[PDB]
Structures are given as structure tokens and as C-alpha cells.
Design a protein around this ligand. Sequence first.
Ligand SMILES: [Ca+2]
Ligand SMILES: [Ca+2]
Ligand SMILES: [Ca+2]
Ligand SMILES: [Ca+2]
Ligand SMILES: [Cl-]
Ligand SMILES: [Cl-]
Ligand SMILES: [Cl-]
Ligand SMILES: [Cl-]
Lengths: 439, 437, 440, 439
Amino acid sequence: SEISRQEFQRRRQALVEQMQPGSAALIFAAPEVTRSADSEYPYRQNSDFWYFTGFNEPEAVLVLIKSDDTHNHSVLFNRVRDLTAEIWFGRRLGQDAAPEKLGVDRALAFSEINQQLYQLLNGLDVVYHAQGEYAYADVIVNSALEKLRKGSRQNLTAPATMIDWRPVVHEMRLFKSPEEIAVLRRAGEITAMAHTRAMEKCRPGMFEYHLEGEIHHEFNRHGARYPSYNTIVGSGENGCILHYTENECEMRDGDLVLIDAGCEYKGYAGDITRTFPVNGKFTQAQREIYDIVLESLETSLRLYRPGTSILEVTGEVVRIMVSGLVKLGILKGDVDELIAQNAHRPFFMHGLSHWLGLDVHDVGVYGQDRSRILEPGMVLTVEPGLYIAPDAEVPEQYRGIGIRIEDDIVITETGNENLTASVVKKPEEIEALMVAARK
Amino acid sequence: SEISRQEFQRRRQALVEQMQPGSAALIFAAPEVTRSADSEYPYRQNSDFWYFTGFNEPEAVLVLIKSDDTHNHSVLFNRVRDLTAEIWFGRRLGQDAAPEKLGVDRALAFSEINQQLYQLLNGLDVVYHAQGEYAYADVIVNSALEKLRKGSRQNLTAPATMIDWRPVVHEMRLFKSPEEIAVLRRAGEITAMAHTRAMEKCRPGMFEYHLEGEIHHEFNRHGARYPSYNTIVGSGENGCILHYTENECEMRDGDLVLIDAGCEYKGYAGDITRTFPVNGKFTQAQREIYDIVLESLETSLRLYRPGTSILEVTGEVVRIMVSGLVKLGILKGDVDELIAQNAHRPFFMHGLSHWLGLDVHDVGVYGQDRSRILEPGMVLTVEPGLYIAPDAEVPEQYRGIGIRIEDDIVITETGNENLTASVVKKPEEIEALMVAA
Amino acid sequence: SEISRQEFQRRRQALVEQMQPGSAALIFAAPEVTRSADSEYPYRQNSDFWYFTGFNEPEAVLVLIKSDDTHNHSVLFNRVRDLTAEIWFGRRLGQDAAPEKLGVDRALAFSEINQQLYQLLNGLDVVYHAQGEYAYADVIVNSALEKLRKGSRQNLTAPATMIDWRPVVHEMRLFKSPEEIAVLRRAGEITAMAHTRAMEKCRPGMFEYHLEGEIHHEFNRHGARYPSYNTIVGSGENGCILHYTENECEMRDGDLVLIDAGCEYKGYAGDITRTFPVNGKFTQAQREIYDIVLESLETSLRLYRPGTSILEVTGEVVRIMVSGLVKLGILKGDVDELIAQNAHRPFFMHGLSHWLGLDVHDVGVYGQDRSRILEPGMVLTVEPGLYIAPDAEVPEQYRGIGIRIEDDIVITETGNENLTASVVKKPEEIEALMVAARKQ
Amino acid sequence: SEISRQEFQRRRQALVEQMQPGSAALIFAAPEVTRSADSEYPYRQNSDFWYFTGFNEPEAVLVLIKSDDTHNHSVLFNRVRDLTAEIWFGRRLGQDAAPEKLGVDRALAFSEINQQLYQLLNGLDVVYHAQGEYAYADVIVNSALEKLRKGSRQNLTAPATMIDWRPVVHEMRLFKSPEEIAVLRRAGEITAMAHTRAMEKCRPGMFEYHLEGEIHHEFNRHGARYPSYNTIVGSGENGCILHYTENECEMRDGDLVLIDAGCEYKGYAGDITRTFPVNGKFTQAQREIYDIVLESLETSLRLYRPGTSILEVTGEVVRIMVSGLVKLGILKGDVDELIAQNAHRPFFMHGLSHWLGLDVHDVGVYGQDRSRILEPGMVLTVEPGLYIAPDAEVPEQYRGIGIRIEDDIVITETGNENLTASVVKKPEEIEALMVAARK
Ligand SMILES: [Ca+2]
Ligand SMILES: [Ca+2]
Ligand SMILES: [Ca+2]
Ligand SMILES: [Ca+2]
Ligand SMILES: [Cl-]
Ligand SMILES: [Cl-]
Ligand SMILES: [Cl-]
Ligand SMILES: [Cl-]
């Protein structure tokens, strides 16, 4: 599945529809970033720039100009064709091919942006710009505006109003289109296959990073070259560290391993977490904590629908966790009083759900305490966890256990669709997958 | 193979030995860098900081203080132990464990660097600093120096002299120790296994990125998590693009595929290129270009020894390429006259060799036109290539052929050791490897 | 005359009246500036900050908050009372006294601005800020907005809209109130007395800077401590340089001296130019150029009124200059063709008029080629000049003559009032003035 | 009096003599600074750039190149001749005339500095640069060094060593040459005449700023257009504020007025303070505080010579002040015990002396607590003062009295020469001066 050219054009038009007459919106590409000396990390395009273009080059800027309520047009600044630079560093779209290829009206060389951008902004009332995201973009925009301001003698005038397009554009990204849902569905499936494979390959004596290796190969195999974030493989006590990425230890017989990994497929993130026994079997104590986390996840999946919120569902999860922890003797007291003192917090210290999309922690307004009412098209994770520190003042069999289980869902008219249910999470299904893989 | 804590201590001592009495050298960690929004690329430590510490955390600064010709000591700034931040983001070494763990005398909190660095520089004559590498580091240093200049009412004085330590440190990195050679040997072996595997797995209909996938899994399997640079898999006309990284096309029956890939193992880069037929069988035309490149590589491997240079060996490679290209009718004329007008350059447009180490294009002075005399301990690549553009004015059969073959070597007393010879490059050995797979 | 507390309060309300509900306008004080090492130039407050406060301290910010269409309030950030710093560097207003003294509702310490400004912008839709004027102000505003953007976990939201208040505020400054016109009148008078005195004191052998000294002492004498711009005293060929400030030569018998100087009185600029013979007698050649410049000025003074423009009046001046220059043989040809070829430009290369106010080159939209229709309340200069270079290809006797004559006017309902007519400009009146002063 | 061409050339050679072979020293002009909108304050050249050139234009850089122990040469970057810009804004020296006029070997356009500076630094071992003085200068130098670091392919190499020339140059400025002493002598005399005139013109009912006006007119009259710092005229309680510059109050019959003012003459600062009665007649209480300050100054003037220090002389002044204050009942107790607990500090809270030169608070190392041994050619102020706050707990008649008296001296072989003695400071000479101006 892919995003069509017609979809990119739709997005641009929807932004233009919300712009004032006499305005221009400026969307800048991400800079290339150094990894060490003259080598660079693999390029990752700014999510917003990508959302409106599908264009994966640096040194580019999209300018949408709304002259009035019917007339509008697009100008792309991008790198010029250069035979030498392309033999060396890769093909460039260039100016001639860009209009037909990206569906923009005009293309100009990026090297000319300071000579041209002020001419595009001249006489407009409003400039839309995401200030403070990239210093290089701010320099370009502020110089343009400064030429216009200081140029009353050449009959230049600057727009007096600057508006951040992020609130509106992030609100657009919060609501996935059917094409985006299908892409995220594929991201979820690829990611689920990677987690399935990790479970099938895991043996005591392997290192955490070996599972990372299996996961990334599976991502790549389906055309998702890069992870959407750094892969976490935390065995034993490392499971109690939420964003553990060192992945450097030998996995022990008798420990759990927690894998939090997600692919990036056509820009969109998958984000799954599975925790499972390194040896293919849960200890009593591991099963007991696992079942509480599973029940929390399974309940959240049943509950999530239009009209509730992350806050409301979180309240039910807390109740389940506190009840479960009291049965096991990890917490002591009355359930309702313990909920009122947030006594679960030493053991479950993060949110249940975040938005998901072109960024793994995707954009969009959550409301106070994530109280925003859910509607169809919203995509989010569900990631309950319990983490019992190695030195926690609790019964001893539970120490050093870190468990999180996470799926990705999209809210529909009647509930939600689970995008990552094709990788097992029921403990008996995990044991059957693994024990079968040993033979 | 690995770098011992005692080697890290020896490198620090060798820098201190070169420092003036009454001085301090400052070596800053790399910043974390954004990939998108709040997500970051996997951390890569500054190569020079790493060289002196083996420490893979950001927000750290190594300060070596030479008080005089016999007394010296080290202070590390690094992140404080923080239970919450570690639960969330990973273990930190902290201050208590750092002295014993890294072999430094004192450790202080990085968040205190602005209150403490000026006190360490106060009264010294010289500060050693790599200016312009990281903006955050320059701010810290300039701010410390400024407090000293402007604090005479508090009996503070600034060093009047700042010296770039990079020329000296890079000259040290140019000459590999036996430990380093053994690490680079392992990197070469791991990288070669990855290239072997790519050749064994390649079939028409697979995509370029599938070979990248095979290569990275093999890197990871041997404990080299990350490539030393972005992997190149250029099939067909994509082979004619030197740093082709899109790796997005279907590999066609009848095309060559060029793979440029290297692992990073304990900080050190492997760097191999192999070109081979996607279908396991060179066409006649592909074989004819391949043999010229291979002969260039083989002659280079024969010649590289102490007392010659990259420039000198390049001269021999140019002669082989020009002769070969005349024989095939790609160039027309007298060999010596064609060499004199650099007629090879449309087809071979890059250098033959670069230094190799903590960076794939490693530090160290090359001399004018890479004329520097080679000595034992230098590690370099040998990467001849020929690239015939799809529109080049040459016999039709050679158009769109891009071939590079690259090995990594270390100069020894009597020649060089080839670190990456365990992956085949002879055309018959390539064909035999691919059928057997 | 001065600007009353009620007037400053009126200006703030007029800005607030134009602001959107749910907004804040931020107006920052000028930074102190180094003259050399640890010494600073005498403080000059930002003109816009001054317009709204009358407050002459650095490290201060005015915040006007419009909660909705009826509720609004003001917060001033300014330097705290500090006994030690004040013993050393001067009295500070501080937080307790500021509300009553400046007519603001609240005052907070400037050192707390990063901890407080974001709290004031939180939940607002619009922030009004003059971006790019001061780097230190941009850093403060951007940090506040950044804390709000990234503080959604703390229920913080940033205004999505930033609007430059300069177009509106500069449009307000373009139209002077009666109190402002009375202040500018006094500035014009003080400045005229300084130019009168310079004419009276000038003798051959004195240096150009001596006249500068006379002028500045006169400004100071009436309570205008500082000039509104760097004084120009160009004798001989130095008169042909428009902003000649070196003022370093001996004034020669036979040369003209051109003096361009203006006081700054309660923030407002006077701006006069007079040119006169160093020896008290215009030669024939000097008098012939002078008369053309004078006729241009006197005619522009009649012409300027509501309904015309600087461009239209400039057209009339060009005609007078070209006709005059043809009569002397400085230009050759037909008058109308020469006008069409802008043949006057080697001799008159600057504008006739600029706005005048808290800045000598005051703010306000001119329109294309200064074509904006004039209305009552606008204040402007009228400054025709003719500058014949020492090597220009003309009758020899005109070489090295630089003459400018400049008055300040305010447009009224039926014409304009000349604010600087109390210093003479008719050549006979100049000669007569120089004769009476030398009898002492 | 002025600085000759030979002396500017001598200063340059003395710096070059201290430079390492294979090096270049860079000295940058001060930026123009805004006063308001498009108007600028009168240009003030950087003191160090001035010291080595006598050149009063912005957009200029002096480059001294020491090739080896015998060969050296100078390159000036400065503004190009531009007929239009000069008609508008003033004459420029330009490139053709600069060599002969300033005594430099070559002159280039400032607009070419980025294309040329790296070529001058190429292959050198050391660059001397005052880092952190001007941000515009640091950008230029860093950009040059960066082009050189990355230009090994074009056979460029950067100096690996940067040295701050300020310590050496400021040490040169600390020791005045005969030409400099003559110029400072003239500055002292101009400044003394201005203070004499203020005393002669002062009447009750005049404002503080009127005396400022008299002072500045007198500076200007002798060819010193600008003060070396902001003039202070503090009458009454305003005298108790050290750098009181508001100068806005009506001077009252019965008050003292304290005037701290100094001219700038050919770049060098005068710095005088005189305090005197607005009405021309010291009261008993004013005279009593005055005499202690005067004794402190006269004693300092007799003591300052080679081999003592500002710290040592300050100790004597503290003794005089404490004794005097005990005699009046302002301090109570034993003199030596009061000295030991620095009981003078509420009344005398600043230093006795600072260096004087191209900056009023001139450059040069003072040593800890100003303990550096004085030698011939050092120039310094002597400025004892007593300030009794309006609310101080002392006999009523001393409240609100602020008195400072300040002269400028140059240390000589056998003592010092007082550069500002031509303005009276004895209380009976002040009264007689004022009475004579009134008759
Ligand atoms: Ca997640
Ligand atoms: Ca290579
Ligand atoms: Ca004017
Ligand atoms: Ca002083
Ligand atoms: Cl471009
Ligand atoms: Cl820290
Ligand atoms: Cl404050
Ligand atoms: Cl220039």
C-alpha cells in the first residue's frame, strides 16, 4: 500500500482552503545531519514536509500561495540538476521534472531561494511558518521579511502577520485518511511479523542485539528499510528501563525479554511491544504480572471507541492494575484508597496511549490529561506496563520483572481496528509459538 | 578483538606528553541528533572523544590537565546518576564509578561544567580545543575563557594561547596500534562475510534493498550493530552513481550489481566494494571491464608497501586503465598521450585510496595529491573503478556498466596485509560462489 | 511643553482598541550600547517604547493584555530596586512605584521575565511583537513561545498568530496629537535659536566644530540635552556632502557654511538647515544659487497642505530648480526636456521632505515615490538643496557651492504651520543678523 | 599635540617584534551602532585598532604578517572609494591612498575580506586574534580558519594556534610614550578649563545639565568634540550617586554639586572630579568632609611614585578617612580597629585609582587588589571620595553630602606629574574663583 499523488494534492488543497486570501505557507525540508565527520545519517525528511509532498530530498521548500479565494498556486524550491553532484551523491529531481512529478505549478533552484522568496511574499498579508523548528529555515524567512520591511523604496511590503501552520496541519495529521490507514495497516503487519520472528528465534545465550538484528531484517524484507525509532530489547532487569536501547547483554534462561520495536513504512510508524520468556516458559511470578498487563490491554481494546478518551480508559486500567497488585501482595490496602493515592505509579509510570502516524509519538492535541474525545480516524497505541524494580519493597519473586504489551489501533465508527493483532500476546499462544520453534 | 582500557590510557598519556606544561586539552562528546520530532538517531560518539575514552554517552567532556613536565591528571564531566532518567532512557555511568571504569582521576557532573571549567583553565598558559567542530562546545569554551578574562577582580587569568589538538591527534590515529589492527582485521572479516552472503543470496527479481538487508543482518550477527556508512547497492545504471543509496530498484537479469558496504565494529570501519552479476554470470562485455578493474586492484595490492605512495600507485592504475580501455575501443589513440591528457577521468573520477579507521574516510594528512610516503601502521582502502555512463560515446555493449572492487589493507614492514581478502573478487570464484549457494 | 500622563494612557488604549480579543502586545526597551570598553553612550530609549510610556530606563518591557473586548490590563517589567546598584549607577523606579508613576496595573522585576512572560501569553490567540528590531527581545519572545508549544503536559498553549504592531503604531505616530505638536513647536524654536546663534557667532578662522559647540550649548540651555542626529557643519566644499559630520576644517573667508542640526526635546526631533556666508556677505554667485533654493523652499511652504503630496510639491521644486539652473548656464537646453531627463539630479539628489517626530526620519508610510495624500497632523521637513561639485562642468564661479535650507512644518486644516520660521533664511535678513551680532 | 605617523608605525613594529615567525595579527574596527532606527551614535573607533592606525572609519581590519624574523608586512582592509556613498555619508580613504596615508604596505576592499583573509592566513602557524570582542569579527576569523581546515585538497592549511594579543597590547598601552603623555597633558588641561568654567558659571536656580552644557562647550572649543564618558553633575543627594548622569534637578542654594567629567582628545581621556558649593560658600559641615577628601588626594599626590602601588597608597587614604570620620563623630571607636573592620566602606566604596588612556578605565594588569608596583609612564587617576547617605546614622549636618575630588597623574622617575592641577581644589581657592566670576 502507498500514498497516491492525488492524496498529496488533496492535502495541499485542504491547507490552502484554510489559509487567508493574500497569503503564503512555507514548508521546509529537514537538514542533513552528521553522524561522524563527513558521513551522514540516512536522510529522514521532515514529517510535515513529507505529508504535503512525498519528496525525500533535502534543500527544498514548498511554497503554497493563496492570491485570493479562487486563485492559488504552488512553488517548489529544490536542488538543481548537476551531473557531477549526481554521479557522486545520487539522482536529483531538478526543476523541469518537478511540476509534473510532485504536482506543483512551478519549481525553482534552492540556491536562488534568498533572491526569490521575498518576491513571493511581497504584498501578501500573511505568511504561514513554523518558527523555531529549524534554525536554517528561520534565517531564510527572517531575511526575506527583513528585505521587504526595509524596502519601501523599491515598492516592497512585508506581511504583517505570521501564523504557525502547525496547529492546523497537526490536526489534519491526527485524522487519518483511508489511504493512510491502509499504509499504517501494512506497517502494523510488517512490525508484527518482526516481533513474531523475534519470539521464534529467541534462545538463552543469544544477545539482546541479535533479536534487534532479526527484527530489522524482517522490516527490510517487506520494504521498510528503517525503524520508526530505536529498537529496545530489554532482558531481565533491562525490561524495567522504558527506552533501554543498549541491547548489549546475554539473555538468560529464566528471564523475560521485552521488545519494543516498530518499522517505518512509507513514512508511517508501526509501534509494537511484546514481552516473553527467553526460555519459552513464564515463571509463576512472571505469568502473574503478565496477566494483569494483558488484562489491561485486552480491556483497553474492548473499550476504545468514539466518545471515550485515553484518560477515561486509563482510569479502568489503573483499577485493574491496582486490584491485581493487591491480590499478589505487591500493594497492601483497600483498592479504592490506593487508586486515590495513585499507588500504582511506582509500577506503571507512563501513559497508556499516544497518537501514531508519520511520527511514532505523533502530533495532535491530546486535551488536558489526554481527555480529548476520540473520533473515527484517530490512530493510537495501547501500551500498558508494569515494572517492578530489582530493589522494590515487595515480595521477592516479582523483583526485576518488566512487562509491557502494546498494540496499534485505529478508531472506527463502532469501536476500533487492531492493526497489530497478527502477533500473539496470550501467554499460552506465546509458549506454543516458541516451544514449536525449538523444533 | 577489542581495545583494552590500558590502550585508552596510553593514548591519553601520549597526548599529554606532547602538551606544553601549564595546559589543558578539552575533548567533547558528540551531541545527540534528531531524526524526527522527539525521536533521535542512534547515538554515534565523536571519533576523537571515543579514541581517548571508549565512552559512549553524550553530555561528556574529557579534560586532560598538564600542570608541568611530571604532574598531570584527568577530569571527566559526564551525566549524573538520576534514577528517573535512567528508568526512562538507560543506565548512566555517573561520577562515582567513572574514575575506576574509564581510568580518569576525577569525575564531575556535566550540568556543572559552566561553574567548573573556568576554574580548571584558570592560570594555565594554553588550552587545546578543536574549534568549529561543535557549536555547543565552542559556547562552553568561549564562556569559560570570557569569565577568566573578565574576572581579574577575583584573581582569574585566561590562557592566552589556544591550540587545535586535531593535527596531532589525527596524526596519532593515522598510525594504528597492534590492538587497532586486530579490531580492523575483525571489521574486515565481518564485512567480507556480509558481502559473501549478499553474493550468495542475490537473484533476479529481488530488490537492491534486500541485499542491504542481508548485509546488515550479517553485520549485526557478529556484534557490529551499525554500518560505518550508508550502504550502497547499485544495480544496472545505478552502479555508475558512486554513493547510490536509494537502493529501491528491482535487480534485473543481465545487470551487474555494485555493493559498497562496511560495518562499524568497536568504532572501527570496514569498507568493501564488490561488483557481480545479478544472475551469477558475467556477460562478455561486463567481464572485459571487470578484468581491467581487478588488474588495477591486484597490481595495487602487489605494489603497496612502505616507501611508495597513493599518488605513485595511482599512476600505475591509470596506465592499466588507459591501456585496457584502448584495447576495447572505449578510448582511441596513443596510450602515453591519453595518460597525459587524463583521458581516463570520464570513467574513473575518484581517488584510488583513502585512510581507514574510526571514520571510514579516516583522518590524517595525505600530502599534496596523496603523495605522502607510506609507513607501517597506516590503514587504507584500495578501490579502483570504471563507470561507463548509459549515454557515453563508446561501443554499445559497455554502456551503463559501473564496476568498483575494494579491499582494506594495513601497511606492514615488507608490504601490506589485505584485511578483506576472505571475500572473493576473481570472476570465476564469484561465479562458482553464486552457483553453489 | 510636555506629554501628559493622560496622553500616554490614551496611546496605550488606542493600541488596545485595535488589538484582537485574547491577545498581548509586547514592547521592549532599547538595549544599552557600548561606546568603548566598559563605557556606554548616553541611553536613548526605543522610540516606540517611549511613545507608550515616557520611561527612560533599559531592561524594561511593556505588556498590554486584551482579555476580551471590555477587559484589558498592563504589566511592566522593569529593574528592581537595588540600593547598591543605585548608589553606583542611578535611581531606578522599581516595582512598587511603577503602577502610579507610569499608569500601568502591575509591575514585575525584569530578571523574572523568562519565568513570567510565558504565563502571560498562555492561552492567548495573538501576540503582537516587532520581530527583528532587537535580537535580545526576539530571544525572550521565542523562548516564551517555545515553552508554551512544548508545555502541553502542563496545559500550556502558545498563540498561533504573531502580528507586527509596527504598521499600526507607526501610523499612529504619523498623526501628531495637539500635545505632540506643542512639543515639536518647542523643539523647532529651540533648534531655531541654536541656528540663529551659530550665524551670530560665525567668523572666518573659527573651525566648523566651533559652530557645533555653539549649537549644542544652545540646545542644552533650553533643556534639550542631546541632538536628534549628528550635527553637520560643512563649509566650502564640505557643504556638497549631505551628511558631513567630520566638522574639522577652518572656515574660510569667502566660503559658505551649511549647518544641519536639530535638538531632541522630550524625545521629539527638530531638524533645521541653514546655509550662510562665513564672512557675513553672500557673493553674487552664492546668492544666485541661494535664491533658487530659497524660492523652492518658500514655494513648497505655500504649496504644502491637505490634499497634495510630497511627490506633487517635489515636481514644482524640480521645475523651479531646472529653470533657475538654465538661467545661470549650469544646465543647457529646453526646460521641459531637461525636467523629463531628470537633469536636476546631479545637483539635487535627495528627497524634498521626510516625516518628523520621535525620530528625525520619522516612521510612517510614504506611498510610492512619496505620493501619499497629506492630512492634518502630519509633520514633515522641507529641505531643498543644490550642490555643485568642485569638478562639475559648469561656469567656474558656481563650483564647490553646497546649499540647503530646511524648515519643519505641521499640516493643518487650511495649510501648514511653520515650526522653524523664527530663524531667518532671506539672504538680506541673514546679512543683517550677522552685522548686528558683530557690533557686540 | 598629536600622535605621529612614525609612532603608529613604531607601535606596529613593536607588536610584530613580539610575534612568532610565520604568524598574522588581526585587529578589527568597531562596528557602527544604532542610536534610534536609522540614526547612529557618533562613531567611536575600537581603542586597540586606533592605537595601531589612527584610522577613524568602520569596516576596516589591520593585518600584520610576520613571515619570519626579518620579513614582515601590513595589509589593511577598508571601504572602497564610492562616489555616491561619499556624496551621501562622507569621504573615505579608499585603497589607493591608504598605503602612504596610514603607513601600511597594501590595502584591499573590506567587501573582499572573506575571499582574501584565508589566503593571508594560509600556511601560517599562528593567528593573533582578540576573540569575543566583536561577534562580526569572530564570524570572519572562524570562517577563514574553517575554509583552511577543509581545504587540504586545494593545499590549504590553517594555523593550529590562536593567541590573544590583548595581554601584550594592553601592556604596551599601560606604558605611555612621550607623545602620548603630551596628548594626555592637553586632555587634562582642556578638562581642567571645563571644570574651572563650570565653577565660574554655577548659580542657584540653574539646572545640573546647564553645567554639563558649559563643560561640553569648553571641550569642543579646544578641539575635543566628545566626552570620554557620560558627564555627571550631582547636586545635593545626587552627589552620593557615583555615576549619576540624569543631571535633571535644579541646583539649590546650600547644596554641593559634584561634577565628574572628562574630554576625549585624539582618543585619550581626561577624567576630573571637582565638588563645590552651588552658592560659592562651603558651610562648616561641607568643609569638614571636604578637607578629609582633599587631604586624602594631596597625600596620594605626594606619595605616588615608582616603587609604591595603588594598594599601598589606598591604605594611607583609608587611615586618613577613618581618623577624620572619628574626629567628626561619624565613626565611633579606636582608629586601628575601625580600619581592621573596613568601617570606612559605607562612606568610601570605590577604588582610589584606575589607569587612564585611550579608555577612561584604561587597560592594563592591576595585580591582586591593585598591588602592582608602579613604574614611569603609567597614567592613573586619584579620586578619593566620601558619601554620607541622606539616611545614614550620623550627626544630622553631614547627611546627603557627597564629595569626590579627582586628578590625573603620570608616574615619572622621581614621583608624578599632575596633569589636572590647573583647576583649583583648595576650598579657599574655589570660593575665591566663584566670588571673582560673580564680581
Ligand atoms: Ca509506543
Ligand atoms: Ca571506500
Ligand atoms: Ca532633514
Ligand atoms: Ca575616574
Ligand atoms: Cl540548488
Ligand atoms: Cl548532569
Ligand atoms: Cl531586575
Ligand atoms: Cl568595501
